[PDB]
Amino acid sequence: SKLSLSSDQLNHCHQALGVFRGKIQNPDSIAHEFTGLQANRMWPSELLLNSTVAMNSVNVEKNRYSDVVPFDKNRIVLNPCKDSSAKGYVNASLIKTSESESISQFIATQGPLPHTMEDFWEMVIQQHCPIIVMLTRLVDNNRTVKCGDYFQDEDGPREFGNISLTTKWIKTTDTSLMLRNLEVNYKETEDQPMSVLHIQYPEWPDHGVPKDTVAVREILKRLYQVPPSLGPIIVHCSAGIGRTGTYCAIHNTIQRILAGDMSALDLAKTVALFRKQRIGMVQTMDQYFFCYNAIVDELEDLTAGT
């Protein structure tokens, strides 16, 4: 829970901090950026041509929301998959800005449905994802289900067709995170099972923002240590675009500043790139402001006492 930065990295964090802090001091500039992103949005009819597999009659019931689907160009494919007519379909998108051993790639995905939980765990195994970031409750206070329980094993070991799941431990933090060390494998015990750290945050409301940036920044602080080469970080909420896109923007921006990518200072450009990779990433102007506040707060931590 402390980073040793090089002189280069500290200079880049100071340079970024002055820019992002100047943006928060001129909030009209941030509002203007988000209004511009919304003016340049993709319209739903475009999905009929760029997201054909998601919109297939065989796959429509595998989508939590009819207008939040991955593009064909970067959807995550199950390979092998039990049904060739499905073309390996899971509602999941590769989010990748850079080809650097220092910059994580993400899988942005929807909160799993009861009938897509085997698909989800098959994706985790096939992509060897070391981390799951979960940014939703299962059910909201209006009593709407937002995500299925694909991970609790209080009754006994969970099974998903050919896949078994077991919890090694559960640990909480002071900032309300729930840390679950999970073990997943196929029932044919060819090799040792796979370890996945599951991080759940229940205090980020749907289409809203946390009251402060501390819990979200603790997720990033715990993941600084995880080598990007271990595999994609799964990030999901309910649709996998609003809270998911906001978290990805904070994580990706900080990593790219630390890696020396000047373009990370243009958060609007990052969000536009994310939107070319999954429709609607970062849903609200409050979420866009929260990105700026979290990035400033984290850059203040990274440069403290320098």
PDB file of C-alpha atoms in Angstrom:
ATOM      1  CA  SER A   1       0.000   0.000   0.000  1.00  0.00           C
ATOM      2  CA  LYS A   2       2.847   2.456  -0.958  1.00  0.00           C
ATOM      3  CA  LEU A   3       4.459   2.929  -4.434  1.00  0.00           C
ATOM      4  CA  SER A   4       8.163   3.665  -5.094  1.00  0.00           C
ATOM      5  CA  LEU A   5       8.120   6.042  -8.088  1.00  0.00           C
ATOM      6  CA  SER A   6      11.057   7.039 -10.317  1.00  0.00           C
ATOM      7  CA  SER A   7      12.017  10.722 -10.817  1.00  0.00           C
ATOM      8  CA  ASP A   8      10.391  10.486 -14.299  1.00  0.00           C
ATOM      9  CA  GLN A   9       7.138   9.091 -12.802  1.00  0.00           C
ATOM     10  CA  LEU A  10       7.001  11.785 -10.068  1.00  0.00           C
ATOM     11  CA  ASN A  11       7.521  14.621 -12.628  1.00  0.00           C
ATOM     12  CA  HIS A  12       4.730  13.134 -14.790  1.00  0.00           C
ATOM     13  CA  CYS A  13       2.374  12.875 -11.783  1.00  0.00           C
ATOM     14  CA  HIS A  14       3.102  16.540 -10.794  1.00  0.00           C
ATOM     15  CA  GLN A  15       2.528  17.656 -14.406  1.00  0.00           C
ATOM     16  CA  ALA A  16      -0.737  15.672 -14.595  1.00  0.00           C
ATOM     17  CA  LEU A  17      -1.858  16.909 -11.149  1.00  0.00           C
ATOM     18  CA  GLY A  18      -1.531  20.572 -12.185  1.00  0.00           C
ATOM     19  CA  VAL A  19      -3.619  19.908 -15.317  1.00  0.00           C
ATOM     20  CA  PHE A  20      -6.386  17.821 -13.650  1.00  0.00           C
ATOM     21  CA  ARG A  21      -6.553  20.169 -10.621  1.00  0.00           C
ATOM     22  CA  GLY A  22      -6.883  23.128 -13.017  1.00  0.00           C
ATOM     23  CA  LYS A  23      -9.842  21.322 -14.671  1.00  0.00           C
ATOM     24  CA  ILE A  24     -11.646  20.797 -11.295  1.00  0.00           C
ATOM     25  CA  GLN A  25     -11.005  24.513 -10.506  1.00  0.00           C
ATOM     26  CA  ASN A  26     -12.778  25.370 -13.834  1.00  0.00           C
ATOM     27  CA  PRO A  27     -15.714  22.916 -13.675  1.00  0.00           C
ATOM     28  CA  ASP A  28     -17.423  24.508 -16.728  1.00  0.00           C
ATOM     29  CA  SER A  29     -14.503  22.952 -18.751  1.00  0.00           C
ATOM     30  CA  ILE A  30     -15.366  19.443 -17.462  1.00  0.00           C
ATOM     31  CA  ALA A  31     -19.132  19.913 -18.077  1.00  0.00           C
ATOM     32  CA  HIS A  32     -18.360  21.120 -21.661  1.00  0.00           C
ATOM     33  CA  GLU A  33     -16.249  17.976 -22.308  1.00  0.00           C
ATOM     34  CA  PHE A  34     -19.096  15.645 -21.218  1.00  0.00           C
ATOM     35  CA  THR A  35     -21.751  17.588 -23.205  1.00  0.00           C
ATOM     36  CA  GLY A  36     -19.469  17.224 -26.267  1.00  0.00           C
ATOM     37  CA  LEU A  37     -19.080  13.458 -25.706  1.00  0.00           C
ATOM     38  CA  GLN A  38     -22.891  13.125 -25.448  1.00  0.00           C
ATOM     39  CA  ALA A  39     -23.337  15.157 -28.699  1.00  0.00           C
ATOM     40  CA  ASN A  40     -21.031  12.603 -30.445  1.00  0.00           C
ATOM     41  CA  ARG A  41     -22.815   9.506 -29.047  1.00  0.00           C
ATOM     42  CA  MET A  42     -23.575   6.335 -30.982  1.00  0.00           C
ATOM     43  CA  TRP A  43     -27.298   5.857 -31.665  1.00  0.00           C
ATOM     44  CA  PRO A  44     -28.956   2.507 -30.836  1.00  0.00           C
ATOM     45  CA  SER A  45     -29.781   1.608 -34.491  1.00  0.00           C
ATOM     46  CA  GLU A  46     -25.997   1.464 -35.150  1.00  0.00           C
ATOM     47  CA  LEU A  47     -25.852  -1.693 -32.968  1.00  0.00           C
ATOM     48  CA  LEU A  48     -27.848  -3.611 -35.633  1.00  0.00           C
ATOM     49  CA  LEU A  49     -24.775  -3.353 -37.935  1.00  0.00           C
ATOM     50  CA  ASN A  50     -21.809  -3.286 -35.499  1.00  0.00           C
ATOM     51  CA  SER A  51     -23.107  -5.769 -32.842  1.00  0.00           C
ATOM     52  CA  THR A  52     -24.721  -8.482 -35.000  1.00  0.00           C
ATOM     53  CA  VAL A  53     -23.755 -11.445 -32.777  1.00  0.00           C
ATOM     54  CA  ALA A  54     -25.186  -9.789 -29.613  1.00  0.00           C
ATOM     55  CA  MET A  55     -28.432  -8.920 -31.502  1.00  0.00           C
ATOM     56  CA  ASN A  56     -28.812 -12.552 -32.829  1.00  0.00           C
ATOM     57  CA  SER A  57     -32.098 -14.290 -31.877  1.00  0.00           C
ATOM     58  CA  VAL A  58     -30.037 -17.115 -30.225  1.00  0.00           C
ATOM     59  CA  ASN A  59     -28.155 -14.558 -27.990  1.00  0.00           C
ATOM     60  CA  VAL A  60     -30.775 -11.867 -27.122  1.00  0.00           C
ATOM     61  CA  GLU A  61     -31.728 -13.550 -23.779  1.00  0.00           C
ATOM     62  CA  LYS A  62     -27.999 -13.461 -22.772  1.00  0.00           C
ATOM     63  CA  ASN A  63     -28.178  -9.625 -22.532  1.00  0.00           C
ATOM     64  CA  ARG A  64     -29.370  -7.989 -19.293  1.00  0.00           C
ATOM     65  CA  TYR A  65     -30.288  -4.835 -21.265  1.00  0.00           C
ATOM     66  CA  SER A  66     -31.299  -4.813 -24.943  1.00  0.00           C
ATOM     67  CA  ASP A  67     -29.235  -1.666 -25.871  1.00  0.00           C
ATOM     68  CA  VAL A  68     -26.015  -2.542 -23.942  1.00  0.00           C
ATOM     69  CA  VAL A  69     -24.140  -5.142 -26.009  1.00  0.00           C
ATOM     70  CA  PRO A  70     -20.536  -5.594 -27.185  1.00  0.00           C
ATOM     71  CA  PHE A  71     -19.403  -4.673 -30.687  1.00  0.00           C
ATOM     72  CA  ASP A  72     -18.507  -7.608 -32.934  1.00  0.00           C
ATOM     73  CA  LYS A  73     -15.008  -6.130 -33.439  1.00  0.00           C
ATOM     74  CA  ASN A  74     -13.885  -6.572 -29.782  1.00  0.00           C
ATOM     75  CA  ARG A  75     -16.409  -8.867 -28.042  1.00  0.00           C
ATOM     76  CA  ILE A  76     -14.913 -11.616 -25.891  1.00  0.00           C
ATOM     77  CA  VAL A  77     -15.529 -14.999 -27.549  1.00  0.00           C
ATOM     78  CA  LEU A  78     -15.909 -18.294 -25.672  1.00  0.00           C
ATOM     79  CA  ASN A  79     -13.592 -20.736 -27.524  1.00  0.00           C
ATOM     80  CA  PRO A  80     -14.296 -23.545 -27.081  1.00  0.00           C
ATOM     81  CA  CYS A  81     -18.090 -22.995 -26.774  1.00  0.00           C
ATOM     82  CA  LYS A  82     -20.888 -25.572 -26.416  1.00  0.00           C
ATOM     83  CA  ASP A  83     -23.158 -24.042 -29.142  1.00  0.00           C
ATOM     84  CA  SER A  84     -21.610 -23.040 -32.507  1.00  0.00           C
ATOM     85  CA  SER A  85     -24.806 -21.102 -33.521  1.00  0.00           C
ATOM     86  CA  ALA A  86     -24.077 -18.735 -30.546  1.00  0.00           C
ATOM     87  CA  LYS A  87     -20.592 -17.862 -31.979  1.00  0.00           C
ATOM     88  CA  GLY A  88     -19.133 -18.028 -28.454  1.00  0.00           C
ATOM     89  CA  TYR A  89     -21.263 -15.093 -27.311  1.00  0.00           C
ATOM     90  CA  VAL A  90     -20.897 -13.426 -23.916  1.00  0.00           C
ATOM     91  CA  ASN A  91     -21.880  -9.795 -23.182  1.00  0.00           C
ATOM     92  CA  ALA A  92     -18.270  -8.699 -22.617  1.00  0.00           C
ATOM     93  CA  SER A  93     -15.902  -6.230 -24.328  1.00  0.00           C
ATOM     94  CA  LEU A  94     -12.093  -5.943 -24.438  1.00  0.00           C
ATOM     95  CA  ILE A  95     -11.049  -2.487 -23.191  1.00  0.00           C
ATOM     96  CA  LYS A  96      -7.448  -1.887 -24.254  1.00  0.00           C
ATOM     97  CA  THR A  97      -5.732   1.490 -24.814  1.00  0.00           C
ATOM     98  CA  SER A  98      -2.052   0.444 -24.954  1.00  0.00           C
ATOM     99  CA  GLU A  99       0.330  -2.481 -25.543  1.00  0.00           C
ATOM    100  CA  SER A 100       2.488  -2.040 -22.427  1.00  0.00           C
ATOM    101  CA  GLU A 101       3.476  -4.458 -19.630  1.00  0.00           C
ATOM    102  CA  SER A 102       2.631  -1.495 -17.294  1.00  0.00           C
ATOM    103  CA  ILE A 103      -0.979  -0.805 -18.513  1.00  0.00           C
ATOM    104  CA  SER A 104      -3.851  -3.195 -17.597  1.00  0.00           C
ATOM    105  CA  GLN A 105      -6.427  -4.329 -20.111  1.00  0.00           C
ATOM    106  CA  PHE A 106     -10.015  -4.849 -18.956  1.00  0.00           C
ATOM    107  CA  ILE A 107     -13.001  -6.993 -19.787  1.00  0.00           C
ATOM    108  CA  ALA A 108     -16.050  -4.744 -19.326  1.00  0.00           C
ATOM    109  CA  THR A 109     -19.068  -7.004 -18.867  1.00  0.00           C
ATOM    110  CA  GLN A 110     -22.659  -6.992 -17.520  1.00  0.00           C
ATOM    111  CA  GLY A 111     -23.570  -8.337 -14.090  1.00  0.00           C
ATOM    112  CA  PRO A 112     -24.153 -12.139 -14.984  1.00  0.00           C
ATOM    113  CA  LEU A 113     -27.715 -13.501 -15.378  1.00  0.00           C
ATOM    114  CA  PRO A 114     -28.582 -16.891 -13.781  1.00  0.00           C
ATOM    115  CA  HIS A 115     -28.335 -18.538 -17.263  1.00  0.00           C
ATOM    116  CA  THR A 116     -24.986 -16.788 -18.156  1.00  0.00           C
ATOM    117  CA  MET A 117     -23.041 -17.648 -14.978  1.00  0.00           C
ATOM    118  CA  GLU A 118     -21.382 -20.737 -16.569  1.00  0.00           C
ATOM    119  CA  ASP A 119     -20.535 -18.479 -19.571  1.00  0.00           C
ATOM    120  CA  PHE A 120     -19.006 -15.916 -17.175  1.00  0.00           C
ATOM    121  CA  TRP A 121     -16.805 -18.423 -15.308  1.00  0.00           C
ATOM    122  CA  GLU A 122     -15.816 -20.107 -18.604  1.00  0.00           C
ATOM    123  CA  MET A 123     -14.673 -16.630 -19.790  1.00  0.00           C
ATOM    124  CA  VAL A 124     -12.697 -16.128 -16.502  1.00  0.00           C
ATOM    125  CA  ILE A 125     -10.875 -19.467 -17.003  1.00  0.00           C
ATOM    126  CA  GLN A 126     -10.318 -19.095 -20.791  1.00  0.00           C
ATOM    127  CA  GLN A 127      -8.966 -15.500 -20.406  1.00  0.00           C
ATOM    128  CA  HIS A 128      -7.124 -16.385 -17.087  1.00  0.00           C
ATOM    129  CA  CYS A 129      -8.479 -13.162 -15.487  1.00  0.00           C
ATOM    130  CA  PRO A 130      -6.702 -12.622 -12.123  1.00  0.00           C
ATOM    131  CA  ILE A 131      -9.196  -9.999 -10.761  1.00  0.00           C
ATOM    132  CA  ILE A 132     -12.941  -9.303 -10.777  1.00  0.00           C
ATOM    133  CA  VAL A 133     -14.050  -5.760  -9.840  1.00  0.00           C
ATOM    134  CA  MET A 134     -17.742  -5.724  -8.966  1.00  0.00           C
ATOM    135  CA  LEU A 135     -19.285  -2.195  -8.586  1.00  0.00           C
ATOM    136  CA  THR A 136     -22.922  -3.067  -7.808  1.00  0.00           C
ATOM    137  CA  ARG A 137     -25.226  -4.670  -5.292  1.00  0.00           C
ATOM    138  CA  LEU A 138     -27.197  -7.724  -6.444  1.00  0.00           C
ATOM    139  CA  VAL A 139     -30.496  -5.778  -5.814  1.00  0.00           C
ATOM    140  CA  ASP A 140     -31.104  -1.992  -5.564  1.00  0.00           C
ATOM    141  CA  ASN A 141     -33.392  -0.309  -2.981  1.00  0.00           C
ATOM    142  CA  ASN A 142     -36.257  -0.027  -5.547  1.00  0.00           C
ATOM    143  CA  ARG A 143     -35.928  -3.917  -5.270  1.00  0.00           C
ATOM    144  CA  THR A 144     -34.566  -4.363  -8.845  1.00  0.00           C
ATOM    145  CA  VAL A 145     -32.118  -7.277  -9.351  1.00  0.00           C
ATOM    146  CA  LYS A 146     -28.954  -5.764 -10.881  1.00  0.00           C
ATOM    147  CA  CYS A 147     -26.600  -8.787 -10.903  1.00  0.00           C
ATOM    148  CA  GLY A 148     -26.938 -12.534 -10.222  1.00  0.00           C
ATOM    149  CA  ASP A 149     -25.142 -14.296  -7.339  1.00  0.00           C
ATOM    150  CA  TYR A 150     -22.342 -16.069  -9.249  1.00  0.00           C
ATOM    151  CA  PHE A 151     -19.836 -16.140  -6.354  1.00  0.00           C
ATOM    152  CA  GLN A 152     -21.282 -16.813  -2.835  1.00  0.00           C
ATOM    153  CA  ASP A 153     -20.829 -20.428  -1.584  1.00  0.00           C
ATOM    154  CA  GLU A 154     -22.271 -20.217   1.977  1.00  0.00           C
ATOM    155  CA  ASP A 155     -24.403 -23.357   1.290  1.00  0.00           C
ATOM    156  CA  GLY A 156     -21.460 -25.339  -0.164  1.00  0.00           C
ATOM    157  CA  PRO A 157     -19.222 -25.430  -3.286  1.00  0.00           C
ATOM    158  CA  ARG A 158     -20.869 -23.684  -6.284  1.00  0.00           C
ATOM    159  CA  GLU A 159     -21.169 -25.570  -9.592  1.00  0.00           C
ATOM    160  CA  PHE A 160     -21.678 -24.133 -13.089  1.00  0.00           C
ATOM    161  CA  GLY A 161     -21.986 -27.055 -15.517  1.00  0.00           C
ATOM    162  CA  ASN A 162     -18.384 -28.329 -15.852  1.00  0.00           C
ATOM    163  CA  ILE A 163     -17.036 -25.604 -13.467  1.00  0.00           C
ATOM    164  CA  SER A 164     -16.661 -25.732  -9.649  1.00  0.00           C
ATOM    165  CA  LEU A 165     -16.097 -22.583  -7.514  1.00  0.00           C
ATOM    166  CA  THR A 166     -14.755 -22.436  -3.916  1.00  0.00           C
ATOM    167  CA  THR A 167     -13.926 -19.545  -1.556  1.00  0.00           C
ATOM    168  CA  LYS A 168     -10.478 -19.682   0.134  1.00  0.00           C
ATOM    169  CA  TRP A 169     -11.246 -16.624   2.334  1.00  0.00           C
ATOM    170  CA  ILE A 170     -13.383 -13.447   2.623  1.00  0.00           C
ATOM    171  CA  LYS A 171     -11.894 -10.235   4.100  1.00  0.00           C
ATOM    172  CA  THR A 172     -13.413  -6.748   4.489  1.00  0.00           C
ATOM    173  CA  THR A 173     -11.689  -3.350   4.490  1.00  0.00           C
ATOM    174  CA  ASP A 174     -12.338  -0.092   6.448  1.00  0.00           C
ATOM    175  CA  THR A 175     -13.639   1.496   3.147  1.00  0.00           C
ATOM    176  CA  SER A 176     -16.506  -1.128   2.678  1.00  0.00           C
ATOM    177  CA  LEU A 177     -14.712  -3.323   0.094  1.00  0.00           C
ATOM    178  CA  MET A 178     -15.385  -7.111   0.249  1.00  0.00           C
ATOM    179  CA  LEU A 179     -12.321  -9.173  -0.771  1.00  0.00           C
ATOM    180  CA  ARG A 180     -13.001 -12.811  -1.762  1.00  0.00           C
ATOM    181  CA  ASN A 181     -10.121 -15.138  -2.697  1.00  0.00           C
ATOM    182  CA  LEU A 182     -11.878 -17.548  -5.077  1.00  0.00           C
ATOM    183  CA  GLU A 183     -10.759 -20.851  -6.572  1.00  0.00           C
ATOM    184  CA  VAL A 184     -12.285 -21.947  -9.901  1.00  0.00           C
ATOM    185  CA  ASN A 185     -11.596 -25.061 -12.003  1.00  0.00           C
ATOM    186  CA  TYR A 186     -13.137 -27.729 -14.255  1.00  0.00           C
ATOM    187  CA  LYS A 187     -14.150 -31.013 -12.568  1.00  0.00           C
ATOM    188  CA  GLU A 188     -11.552 -32.937 -14.668  1.00  0.00           C
ATOM    189  CA  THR A 189      -8.546 -32.194 -12.401  1.00  0.00           C
ATOM    190  CA  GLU A 190      -5.835 -31.962 -15.099  1.00  0.00           C
ATOM    191  CA  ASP A 191      -4.048 -29.043 -13.331  1.00  0.00           C
ATOM    192  CA  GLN A 192      -4.149 -26.982 -10.089  1.00  0.00           C
ATOM    193  CA  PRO A 193      -7.241 -24.737  -9.841  1.00  0.00           C
ATOM    194  CA  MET A 194      -7.124 -21.012 -10.717  1.00  0.00           C
ATOM    195  CA  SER A 195      -7.112 -18.233  -8.047  1.00  0.00           C
ATOM    196  CA  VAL A 196      -9.212 -15.083  -8.655  1.00  0.00           C
ATOM    197  CA  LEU A 197      -9.414 -12.064  -6.326  1.00  0.00           C
ATOM    198  CA  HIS A 198     -13.014 -10.750  -6.311  1.00  0.00           C
ATOM    199  CA  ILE A 199     -13.447  -7.139  -5.118  1.00  0.00           C
ATOM    200  CA  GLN A 200     -17.013  -5.948  -4.442  1.00  0.00           C
ATOM    201  CA  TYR A 201     -17.995  -2.283  -3.750  1.00  0.00           C
ATOM    202  CA  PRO A 202     -21.880  -1.936  -2.687  1.00  0.00           C
ATOM    203  CA  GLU A 203     -21.933   1.843  -2.130  1.00  0.00           C
ATOM    204  CA  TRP A 204     -21.906   3.051  -5.739  1.00  0.00           C
ATOM    205  CA  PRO A 205     -25.528   3.660  -6.784  1.00  0.00           C
ATOM    206  CA  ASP A 206     -26.776   2.819 -10.298  1.00  0.00           C
ATOM    207  CA  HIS A 207     -26.537   5.988 -12.502  1.00  0.00           C
ATOM    208  CA  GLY A 208     -24.934   7.822  -9.526  1.00  0.00           C
ATOM    209  CA  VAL A 209     -21.608   8.338  -7.721  1.00  0.00           C
ATOM    210  CA  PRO A 210     -20.066   7.478  -4.339  1.00  0.00           C
ATOM    211  CA  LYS A 211     -20.058  10.180  -1.632  1.00  0.00           C
ATOM    212  CA  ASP A 212     -16.187  10.269  -1.718  1.00  0.00           C
ATOM    213  CA  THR A 213     -13.310   8.745  -3.770  1.00  0.00           C
ATOM    214  CA  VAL A 214     -11.640   6.705  -1.003  1.00  0.00           C
ATOM    215  CA  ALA A 215     -13.130   3.206  -1.612  1.00  0.00           C
ATOM    216  CA  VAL A 216     -12.728   3.426  -5.412  1.00  0.00           C
ATOM    217  CA  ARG A 217      -9.088   4.576  -5.033  1.00  0.00           C
ATOM    218  CA  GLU A 218      -8.432   1.688  -2.593  1.00  0.00           C
ATOM    219  CA  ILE A 219      -9.459  -0.736  -5.402  1.00  0.00           C
ATOM    220  CA  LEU A 220      -6.820   0.891  -7.654  1.00  0.00           C
ATOM    221  CA  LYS A 221      -4.220   0.851  -4.841  1.00  0.00           C
ATOM    222  CA  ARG A 222      -4.776  -2.920  -4.320  1.00  0.00           C
ATOM    223  CA  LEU A 223      -4.406  -3.514  -8.096  1.00  0.00           C
ATOM    224  CA  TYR A 224      -1.192  -1.447  -8.621  1.00  0.00           C
ATOM    225  CA  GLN A 225       0.715  -4.674  -7.694  1.00  0.00           C
ATOM    226  CA  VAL A 226      -1.068  -6.959 -10.230  1.00  0.00           C
ATOM    227  CA  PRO A 227       1.047  -7.356 -13.401  1.00  0.00           C
ATOM    228  CA  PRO A 228      -0.978  -6.560 -16.558  1.00  0.00           C
ATOM    229  CA  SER A 229       0.618  -9.669 -18.182  1.00  0.00           C
ATOM    230  CA  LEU A 230      -1.338 -11.940 -15.733  1.00  0.00           C
ATOM    231  CA  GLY A 231      -4.491 -11.273 -17.777  1.00  0.00           C
ATOM    232  CA  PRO A 232      -7.416  -8.873 -18.256  1.00  0.00           C
ATOM    233  CA  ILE A 233      -9.109  -7.327 -15.184  1.00  0.00           C
ATOM    234  CA  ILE A 234     -12.841  -8.049 -15.249  1.00  0.00           C
ATOM    235  CA  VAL A 235     -14.882  -4.948 -14.349  1.00  0.00           C
ATOM    236  CA  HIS A 236     -18.656  -5.168 -14.082  1.00  0.00           C
ATOM    237  CA  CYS A 237     -21.656  -3.390 -12.566  1.00  0.00           C
ATOM    238  CA  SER A 238     -25.174  -4.042 -13.834  1.00  0.00           C
ATOM    239  CA  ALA A 239     -24.888  -3.025 -17.559  1.00  0.00           C
ATOM    240  CA  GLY A 240     -21.062  -2.817 -17.405  1.00  0.00           C
ATOM    241  CA  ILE A 241     -20.782   0.737 -18.836  1.00  0.00           C
ATOM    242  CA  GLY A 242     -21.510   3.535 -16.289  1.00  0.00           C
ATOM    243  CA  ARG A 243     -19.802   2.586 -13.032  1.00  0.00           C
ATOM    244  CA  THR A 244     -17.608   0.133 -15.008  1.00  0.00           C
ATOM    245  CA  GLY A 245     -16.463   2.817 -17.482  1.00  0.00           C
ATOM    246  CA  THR A 246     -15.809   5.324 -14.674  1.00  0.00           C
ATOM    247  CA  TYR A 247     -13.621   2.812 -12.731  1.00  0.00           C
ATOM    248  CA  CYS A 248     -11.745   1.813 -15.936  1.00  0.00           C
ATOM    249  CA  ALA A 249     -11.132   5.529 -16.766  1.00  0.00           C
ATOM    250  CA  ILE A 250      -9.561   6.207 -13.334  1.00  0.00           C
ATOM    251  CA  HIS A 251      -7.411   3.034 -13.379  1.00  0.00           C
ATOM    252  CA  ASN A 252      -6.329   3.481 -16.999  1.00  0.00           C
ATOM    253  CA  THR A 253      -5.556   7.214 -16.648  1.00  0.00           C
ATOM    254  CA  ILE A 254      -3.319   6.760 -13.578  1.00  0.00           C
ATOM    255  CA  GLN A 255      -1.431   3.806 -15.154  1.00  0.00           C
ATOM    256  CA  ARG A 256      -0.868   5.725 -18.401  1.00  0.00           C
ATOM    257  CA  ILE A 257       0.450   8.817 -16.507  1.00  0.00           C
ATOM    258  CA  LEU A 258       2.862   6.523 -14.589  1.00  0.00           C
ATOM    259  CA  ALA A 259       3.945   4.931 -17.917  1.00  0.00           C
ATOM    260  CA  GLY A 260       4.650   8.344 -19.549  1.00  0.00           C
ATOM    261  CA  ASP A 261       1.650   8.542 -21.963  1.00  0.00           C
ATOM    262  CA  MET A 262       0.990  12.317 -22.346  1.00  0.00           C
ATOM    263  CA  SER A 263      -2.393  11.583 -23.979  1.00  0.00           C
ATOM    264  CA  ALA A 264      -3.797  10.363 -20.611  1.00  0.00           C
ATOM    265  CA  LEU A 265      -4.152  14.092 -19.697  1.00  0.00           C
ATOM    266  CA  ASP A 266      -7.070  14.210 -22.179  1.00  0.00           C
ATOM    267  CA  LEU A 267      -9.729  12.337 -20.227  1.00  0.00           C
ATOM    268  CA  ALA A 268     -12.385  13.195 -22.859  1.00  0.00           C
ATOM    269  CA  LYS A 269     -10.217  11.434 -25.487  1.00  0.00           C
ATOM    270  CA  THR A 270      -9.883   8.399 -23.177  1.00  0.00           C
ATOM    271  CA  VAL A 271     -13.652   8.210 -22.633  1.00  0.00           C
ATOM    272  CA  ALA A 272     -14.250   8.595 -26.405  1.00  0.00           C
ATOM    273  CA  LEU A 273     -11.810   5.679 -26.990  1.00  0.00           C
ATOM    274  CA  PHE A 274     -13.617   3.609 -24.371  1.00  0.00           C
ATOM    275  CA  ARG A 275     -16.921   4.374 -26.140  1.00  0.00           C
ATOM    276  CA  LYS A 276     -15.401   3.057 -29.427  1.00  0.00           C
ATOM    277  CA  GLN A 277     -14.820  -0.173 -27.412  1.00  0.00           C
ATOM    278  CA  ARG A 278     -18.146  -0.445 -25.515  1.00  0.00           C
ATOM    279  CA  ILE A 279     -21.217   1.728 -26.126  1.00  0.00           C
ATOM    280  CA  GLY A 280     -21.958   4.344 -23.463  1.00  0.00           C
ATOM    281  CA  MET A 281     -18.896   3.928 -21.176  1.00  0.00           C
ATOM    282  CA  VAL A 282     -19.249   6.626 -18.401  1.00  0.00           C
ATOM    283  CA  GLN A 283     -23.024   7.201 -18.244  1.00  0.00           C
ATOM    284  CA  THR A 284     -23.534  10.531 -16.431  1.00  0.00           C
ATOM    285  CA  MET A 285     -21.975  13.975 -16.002  1.00  0.00           C
ATOM    286  CA  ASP A 286     -21.646  13.253 -12.235  1.00  0.00           C
ATOM    287  CA  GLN A 287     -19.687  10.060 -13.120  1.00  0.00           C
ATOM    288  CA  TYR A 288     -17.435  12.117 -15.435  1.00  0.00           C
ATOM    289  CA  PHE A 289     -16.809  14.634 -12.608  1.00  0.00           C
ATOM    290  CA  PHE A 290     -16.110  11.690 -10.248  1.00  0.00           C
ATOM    291  CA  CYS A 291     -13.404  10.478 -12.716  1.00  0.00           C
ATOM    292  CA  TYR A 292     -11.663  13.878 -12.454  1.00  0.00           C
ATOM    293  CA  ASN A 293     -12.012  14.014  -8.630  1.00  0.00           C
ATOM    294  CA  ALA A 294     -10.692  10.454  -8.166  1.00  0.00           C
ATOM    295  CA  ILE A 295      -7.751  11.066 -10.548  1.00  0.00           C
ATOM    296  CA  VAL A 296      -6.838  14.334  -8.724  1.00  0.00           C
ATOM    297  CA  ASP A 297      -7.167  12.636  -5.276  1.00  0.00           C
ATOM    298  CA  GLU A 298      -4.967   9.732  -6.419  1.00  0.00           C
ATOM    299  CA  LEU A 299      -2.318  12.017  -8.013  1.00  0.00           C
ATOM    300  CA  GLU A 300      -2.197  13.928  -4.644  1.00  0.00           C
ATOM    301  CA  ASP A 301      -1.506  10.586  -2.841  1.00  0.00           C
ATOM    302  CA  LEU A 302       1.150   9.569  -5.428  1.00  0.00           C
ATOM    303  CA  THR A 303       3.005  12.926  -5.062  1.00  0.00           C
ATOM    304  CA  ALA A 304       2.505  13.447  -1.282  1.00  0.00           C
ATOM    305  CA  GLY A 305       5.672  14.856   0.356  1.00  0.00           C
ATOM    306  CA  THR A 306       7.437  15.556  -2.990  1.00  0.00           C
TER     307      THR A 306
END
